[model samples]
Target: EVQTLNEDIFLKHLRERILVLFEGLNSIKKDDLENRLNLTINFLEFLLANIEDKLK
Candidate 1:
């Protein structure tokens, strides 16, 4: 039960952090949009690695 609660809390924090990143993306300048998108893609790839672990 405690482990389940911990996983839930971990997921909540991860969600909040991802949302913050998205909000930050919105504030990026149009001139740097491509660079920002590239960075976001890299970030998503990193997140995907952890996602596979979480699914198991």
Candidate 2:
């Protein structure tokens, strides 16, 4: 089974949480995770841009 989500609200909360986590990660130190998170966020940004345009 699948569940539906409110896109705007979900995205908003997701962005906030991601920043919060990223900030905490930066506050500490994790070279592996830092590099990984940066790459993941980069891909996510591109994915959002491309897919959002597709829908538009």
Candidate 3:
């Protein structure tokens, strides 16, 4: 069986995961993850910007 997910809740979960992950590791390992997370965040921001037009 699968659980239903809320967008806001899932993103919050992702933040928690990131925090736990960085605390456990990082230094360079976490830095690499940070870089990837930032890139994906920027991509999402781009999508959000374009999505406004689609939404309207």
Specify the highest-TM-score model's number.
3
Q: Candidate 1: list runs displaced more than 4 Å.
A: 1-3, 29-56
What CA RMSD would candidate 3 show? 19.1
Q: Local distance difference test, per candidate?
A: 0.87, 0.88, 0.88
lDDT of 1 at 3: 68
Local accuracy of candidate 1 as per-residue lDDT tens digits, 1-56: 45688899999999999999987887676538878889999999999989999999
State in Å the error of residue 55, model 2. Answer: 1.5
* Pairwise TM-score winner, candidates 2 and 3: 3
State the lDDT of candidate 3 residue by residue for 1-56, as single tens digits: 55557867898999999998888775778789899999999999999989997999
What lDDT does candidate 2 reach at residue 8? 70
TM per prediction: 0.45, 0.42, 0.46
- Candidate 3 has what TM-score? 0.46
- Pairs in steric clash, model 3: 26-30
Which parts of model 3 are misplaced by more than 4 Å? 1-26, 54-56
Higher-scoring candidate on TM-score, 1 or 3: 3
